[PDB]
Design a protein around this ligand. Structure first.
Ligand SMILES: N[C@@H](CCC(=O)O)C(=O)O
Lengths: 355, 347
C-alpha cells in the first residue's frame, strides 16, 4: 500500500505483465527495450497506446496526442515557446506550488498576468471566477488542475471565452471523465496515473500548432512532434510502452467512468474520517478538496513520528507530508483501491483511540 | 542475435536482473519504477551510476556527469543554447547525416561555420585537420565521432587549441579508452551503446557551465541539472537505473580496455570478410572505418532480398540499411559478443 505522491504506485497487474514479457515480448525473442522505435512491432505498440488514450478520454480527432520527455516541468517552457507570441500576454492562475513554478518559467518568455491567486484564501480554497482578472486577448490561460502538495483541485472548468485553456493535469488526469474539447492544451507528467517517470503526455488542439517562436528548439516544437508521431527523434520507448499497459489496464477496469466512481468513494472515506474528529485535520474547503492528494495533520504534532512509524509497521507507506507543509499526506491515485484507504482509515482510528 | 543500430541489445545478465527485481527491489516491496528520485534508495542508485561511469571512462573531477532526457537530438539545441554566445561563432564538422542535423539546429541559434566536410571525399573518408578552416575565436568545435549511418568514425582527436571540443559519441562511447580531458563536452544517446532509450549522458567541463542565454529553458540548462544532481525535476528514473546496471556489467567484463580488445576483434573480423571478395563492398577507407557500425553493399543489389531472408532465417537479424543509405549494415556494439560476428561472416 504505497501512498507516495509521485512517482506513484503502478497497478500490480501492470508490473506483473511487464515483468513476464520483459525478455521476450510476444515470443519474438526481444525486449521492448531492445526494439527499434521504427520497427513494425514498436510502431503498433505506440499507435495502440495513443489510440487507447483517445478512447479512454474520448479525445476528439482534431487534437494531437503527444508522448514527449522531460517531465511536466519541461512543459512550463514548451507551452509559452509554442503558444505565447513574443509580444503577447499569458494569463496564469496561482493555486499553489506547481502553478507557481509554471508562472516563473513563463516570465522568461514573455509577459505573465497572474489572473487569480488562492493566497487570498491561504490556499484553502480556489478564487471563484468572478474574482479573476483575465486579459482579453491573452494567448492562453494556464492553470494546474490539481495541486499535488496543497491538496487543492479544480472541480470545474474555467470559462475563458475565446482564450484557449491550458491545464496541468499531471496529478489527476484519467481519474474521472474529462471534456477535452474545452481545452486548447492538456498536459500530464506520467508518474502519477499515466505511468513511468520522464514521460509526458500533451493533448493539444491542432489549430494551435505551427506558431512556435523562432528560438524554440525543434525537439520542443509541438508541430514537429505531431508531424512525426512523437518520433521526431528516439522516444522513451519503454516508458511509452508501459503507459500503454496502463491504458489497457484502465480500459479493462471500466475506463474513466469507473475510476470516477472508485476515486469518489476513496476520497469520501478518507475525508469522512478526517472530518469526524479534531484529532486529524484537513483545512481545505470541500469545494476544492483534491480527490487525488489528501494532506492532513495530527492535532498534536509530537505524535507525527509515532504515527509514521506505526504506519510503516502496518503496510501503509509514504504518508509523510511534503516538507513545505509538514504533517501527513495520502496520495490515492488510480492504482490504489478502496482497500488501501480502508486500511489507512482503520489504522488512523486505532491510532486516535490510543492517543 | 541483434545487429540493430538502435537501440543496442542489452546484455542478457542485465535484462534478467532487471526482470527479477522489477516488482520488489531488494526486498523493499517496491519497483525502482515506483521509487521517488528523492528517496535514499534511488539517490544511491543514481549516485552509483554516476560514479561507476566516472570510473569506467576515468572522468576527471572537474567534469560534471549529467543524466538527461530527450535523446541525442535534443543536444543539437542544448549545446548552442548553453555554450554559444548569441554574438558568437561555432565551428561544426560535417561527416555525414547526424553531424549535419547538429549543424542545421545550431544555425537557428547563431552563426555556424562548417570548417570541414567529408563531401569532397564522398563521405568515404574524413578530411585531415590541415584541410580544416577552423575559426580562431570560436565558442567550440562540434563533430560526431561516429556517424552511425555512414560507418564513418574518428580514430583521432582534433587539436583546436583553447577552443572547446564538443563531440557526439552516442554510438562509440564506452567502446574504447577515452581521454575525457581533451573534451569540453561529450554527449551520448544511451540507446546506442548503453541500451536504455530516451536517456542521454552529457559529460561537460565544470568551467563551461553558467553562461546559457536567457531564452534557454530551465530544463535545458546544464548548470541546472549540474547544481541539482540531474534532478531539478523528475528524471527518467528507470532508464537511469538500467544504465547503471549496464555500467556495473561493464566493470564485471573488464571495463573499457576489455571492450576495446573485444570490439577491435569484431570490427576486424567483419571487415576482413568484406575485403576478401568482390562480392561485398565497404567503400570507407580503413583509417575511418567505424568499429561500431559496419555498412556494406551487395555487388548485385537485386540480390539483397535473399541476403536478408537467409539472415532472418539464421539468427542474424536487423541487417538492413537506413532508408537513405541503401544496402546493409551491422552494428557491433558492446553487448554483442564475438559469436555474433562469427555467426554473421558464415552466412
Ligand atoms: N508488488 C507490489 C507491492 C506489493 C506490496 O508491498 O503491497 C508493487 O510493487 O506494485
Amino acid at each position: 500500500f504505497n501512498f507516495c505522491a509521485g512517482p506513484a504506485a503502478l497497478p500490480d497487474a501492470v508490473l506483473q505483465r511487464a515483468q513476464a514479457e520483459l525478455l521476450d515480448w510476444r515470443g519474438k525473442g526481444l525486449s521492448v527495450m531492445e526494439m527499434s522505435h521504427r520497427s513494425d512491432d514498436y510502431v503498433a505498440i505506440a499507435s495502440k497506446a495513443e489510440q487507447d488514450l483517445r478512447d479512454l478520454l474520448d479525445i476528439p480527432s482534431d487534437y494531437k496526442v503527444l508522448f514527449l520527455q522531460g517531465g511536466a516541468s519541461q512543459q512550463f517552457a514548451e507551452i509559452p515557446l509554442n503558444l505565447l507570441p513574443e509580444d503577447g500576454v499569458a494569463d496564469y492562475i496561482d493555486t499553489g506550488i506547481w502553478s507557481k513554478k509554471a508562472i516563473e518559467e513563463a516570465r522568461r518568455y514573455g509577459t505573465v498576468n497572474v489572473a487569480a491567486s488562492a493566497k487570498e484564501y491561504d490556499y484553502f480554497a480556489i478564487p471563484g471566477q468572478n474574482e479573476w482578472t483575465l486579459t482579453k486577448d491573452a494567448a492562453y490561460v494556464h492553470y494546474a488542475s490539481n495541486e499535488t502538495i496543497g491538496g487543492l483541485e479544480f472541480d470545474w472548468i474555467p470559462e475563458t471565452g475565446d482564450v484557449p485553456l491550458v491545464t496541468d493535469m499531471s496529478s489527476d488526469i484519467l481519474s474521472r471523465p474529462l471534456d477535452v474539447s474545452r481545452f486548447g492544451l492538456i498536459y500530464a507528467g506520467a508518474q502519477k496515473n499515466i505511468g513511468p517517470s520522464g514521460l509526458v503526455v500533451v493533448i493539444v488542439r491542432e489549430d494551435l500548432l505551427g506558431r512556435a517562436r523562432s528560438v524554440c528548439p525543434t525537439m520542443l516544437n509541438y508541430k514537429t512532434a505531431a508531424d512525426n508521431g512523437s518520433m521526431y527523434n528516439t522516444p522513451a520507448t519503454y516508458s511509452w510502452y508501459l503507459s500503454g499497459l496502463v491504458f489497457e489496464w484502465l480500459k479493462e477496469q471500466g475506463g474513466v467512468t469507473a475510476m470516477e466512481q472508485r476515486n469518489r468513494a476513496k476520497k469520501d472515506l478518507l475525508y469522512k474520517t478526517i472530518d469526524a474528529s479534531d484529532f486529524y485535520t484537513n483545512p481545505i474547503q470541500p469545494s476544492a478538496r483534491s480527490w487525488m492528494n489528501v494532506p492532513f495533520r495530527l492535532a498534536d504534532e509530537r505524535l507525527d513520528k509515532p504515527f509514521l512509524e506505526g504506519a510503516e509497521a502496518r503496510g501503509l507507506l509514504n504518508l509523510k507530508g511534503h516538507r513545505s507543509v509538514g504533517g501527513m499526506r495520502a496520495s490515492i491515485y488510480n492504482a490504489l483501491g478502496l482497500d488501501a484507504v480502508e486500511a489507512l482509515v482503520a489504522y488512523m482510528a486505532e491510532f486516535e483511540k490510543e492517543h
